[PDB]
């Protein structure tokens, strides 16, 4: 099971973040399967932001929320996240994650993608 | 033969006392290649219920 992240790493302020998490192992078909997306500053906790399973529920983090689209491209086995108006707090990295099925209870980020330091500058 | 008779005492002659068959070794069954079993890995491996 593979996951790895892709899009521009580095744009100003007021602008938009794009980024695609293309995937190997899983299929957003099955059920229990989901992806979701997890960002960290530097040297900072883990933050949510939104996670999709494999019926398209798109849950959303609240305080994110308003400011985030997440969707997903099953034919190209990838999802696609974005996040408007970006700022230079929010330069972290991030994480495209797995949650599939356990032994009694659904297993949730077992898998992690390899991150995608991005920075918001000038 | 004295079975036959019902006497201690068979007379000089040839008699048919009875007959023999070699009994079936074996036992076996043949079917057909049938090959076509029905989707129940669909409606158990469903991917949505």
């Known amino acids: 099971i593979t996951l790895k992240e892709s899009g521009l790493t580095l744009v100003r302020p007021t602008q938009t973040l794009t980024l695609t998490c293309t995937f190997s192992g899983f299929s957003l078909i099955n059920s229990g399967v989901g992806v979701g997306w997890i960002r960290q500053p530097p040297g900072k906790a883990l933050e949510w932001l939104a996670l999709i399973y494999w019926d398209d529920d798109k849950r959303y983090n609240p305080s994110l929320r308003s400011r985030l689209t997440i969707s997903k491209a099953t034919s190209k086995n990838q999802v696609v996240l974005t996040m408007t108006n970006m700022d230079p707090v929010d330069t972290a990295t991030y994480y495209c994650?797995?949650?599939?099925?356990?032994?009694?209870?659904?297993?949730?980020?077992?898998?992690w993608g390899q991150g995608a330091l991005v920075t918001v500058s000038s | 033969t004295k079975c036959t008779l019902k006497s201690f005492t068979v007379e000089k002659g040839i008699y048919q006392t009875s007959n023999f068959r070699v009994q079936p070794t074996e036992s076996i069954v043949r079917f057909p290649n049938i090959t076509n079993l029905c989707p129940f890995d669909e409606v158990f491996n469903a991917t949505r219920f």
């Open positions: 994650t797995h949650r599939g099925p356990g032994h009694n209870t659904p297993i949730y980020f077992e898998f």
